[PDB]
């Protein structure tokens, strides 16, 4: 799930750079969604969970901004 979480967000970032909000959104929601599921299942501590949460919360905001841009 870790690789899928990173590989997903990684593809979303590149997409956003190539004027691909659509492909970037699907990859973003897929990455963040997989990240959260990984935390609820397994985690290290509040510290680590925080770093993963902040990165997810920020990624989620960008998603809604993309879907809204085209919508």
């Amino acid at each position: 799930t870790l690789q899928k979480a990173i590989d997903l967000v990684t593809k979303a970032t590149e997409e956003d750079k190539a004027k691909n909000y659509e492909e970037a959104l699907r990859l973003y929601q897929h990455a963040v969604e997989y990240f959260l599921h990984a935390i609820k299942y397994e985690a290290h501590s509040d510290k680590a969970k925080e770093s993963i949460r902040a990165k997810c919360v920020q990624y989620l905001d960008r998603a809604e901004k993309l879907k809204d841009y085209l919508r």
């Binding site: 929601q29 963040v32 969604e33 969970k49 989620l60 998603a63 809604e64 879907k67």
Partner: peptide
Amino acid sequence: EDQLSRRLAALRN
């Protein structure tokens, strides 16, 4: 976590 977790679930669905 529930904040973004909820808004995220709505995005996909």
